[PDB]
From a paper:
GSTs are multifunctional enzymes that have evolved from a thioredoxin-like ancestor gene. GSTs catalyze the nucleophilic attack of reduced GSH (γ-Glu–Cys–Gly) on the electrophilic center of these compounds, leading to the formation of GSH conjugates that display higher solubility and reduced toxicity. In the present work, DNA shuffling was employed for the design and creation of a library of tau class GSTs (GSTUs) from abiotic stress-treated Phaseolus vulgaris and Glycine max.
The enzyme that resulted from DNA shuffling, which was denoted as [name] in accordance with the nomenclature proposed by Edwards et al. (2000), clustered together with the tau class GSTs. [name] was crystallized with two molecules in the crystallographic asymmetric unit that followed the typical dimer formation found in other GSTs. The analysis revealed that each monomer of [name] consists of two distinct domains: at the N-terminal region a small α/β thioredoxin-like domain with βαβαββα folding topology is formed. In [name], it is replaced by a Cys residue, a change that could make the H-site more open and possibly alter its binding properties. A fourth hydrophobic residue, Leu134, is replaced by Ala134 in [name], a change that may contribute to weakening of the interface. This residue could interact with Lys102 from the second subunit, forming a strong salt bridge.
Author numbering:
A (entry chain B): 6 to 213
B (entry chain A): 6 to 215
Write the structure that this text describes.
């Protein structure tokens, strides 16, 4: 009967839950939370981290985002996210690990300045440590022809990353340096439902 | 026929695979690795992370350690390691995730010095944020009646951490502070399996004091 999400206006983690949940064809109340100090009924549901996205249904919570994704894929078996073969499903998880390791690309092209920035290099390796292994324009994108988990796990690349370099004024991400997955970023655009769960394009530019 | 693990002589992660791999009643050839710079036929199997344990069988590698445990459960299903219900299957993975999310806590107050030591205090919260929520002297240890996945993910507590403090001369870990899980630490001693892939304790004690 009941299915309840806890999250903010623009967390890429709260996004990765909603998309997965929305492809499933599942309804969901959405209750917002404060950027700073949160509510109590959520901190009761994640007293450990006190972090969104927290996902509950019939009052039973599931904290942390990458574990939520793997819950919903084997509860509603409409539009599978994860591969069906135990080995390629094992490979697929190895990449969501890597996408989570890669996220440290955001923590260096966003929240730094001056010299403490260019004590960096990793992002350029990851994008190559990407493309050159995954293949998302020789055939479709990641997990089969439609949206897989690795796609959703990397939406802070497909959408949020293009919109952040306008805090470093950087042009790392372009069809001259990383062509194979710049056209993959199109993941942002398509899907007449994913097509919102993502906020407006120009509004976010203001925030950075 | 063939099944291969690649790793070092006493990595807590390489232990974490082998026990899991052992419970199922599965053989495994074992190839050792260089403390410093590694071989090529391993980095051909793990060009991305370049850290053991790398696990292969029928030439098909699986790098990264917590995913290997979940691989062995799904083709070799005798005494299942993961829960059957999608919720507790989510929690048990939610718990491996926390144990591994914390892990820089164990490596904080152990192999560091001066200020960066007592700049930790997370260990004492997590160790309480362990037993104050686990409550597994109520029944067995973690996941069900036999060894469950959450246990193996936290073997760097059950074995290494007890050893590892007598380099900073710390006494954080005692049965007086964490009784539900100090008595759990005897997961190592009990159980005819965790026993043997775990090296000697007194040999290991020598390594850290150096």
């Amino acid at each position: 009967e009941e299915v309840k999400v806890y999250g903010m206006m623009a967390s890429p983690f709260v996004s990765r839950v909603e998309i997965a949940l929305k492809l499933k064809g599942v309804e969901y109340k959405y209750e917002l939370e404060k950027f700073g100090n949160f509510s109590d009924t959520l901190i009761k549901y994640n007293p450990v981290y006190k972090k969104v996205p927290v996902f509950v249904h019939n009052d039973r919570p599931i904290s942390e985002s990458l574990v939520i994704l793997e819950y919903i894929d084997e509860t509603w078996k409409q539009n599978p996210l994860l591969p069906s073969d135990p080995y390629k499903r094992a490979l697929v998880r190895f990449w969501t690990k890597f996408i989570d390791d890669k996220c440290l690309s955001a923590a260096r092209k966003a929240t730094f300045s001056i010299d403490e920035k260019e004590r960096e290099k990793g992002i350029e390796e990851t994008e190559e440590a990407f493309q050159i292994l995954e293949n998302e324009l020789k055939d479709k994108f990641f997990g089969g022809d439609e949206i897989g988990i690795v796609d959703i796990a990397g939406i802070f690349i497909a959408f949020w990353f293009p919109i952040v370099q306008e805090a470093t004024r950087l042009k790392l991400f372009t069809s001259e340096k990383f062509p194979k997955l710049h056209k993959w970023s199109e993941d942002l655009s398509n899907h007449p439902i994913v097509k919102e769960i993502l906020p407006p394009r120009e509004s976010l530019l203001a925030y950075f």
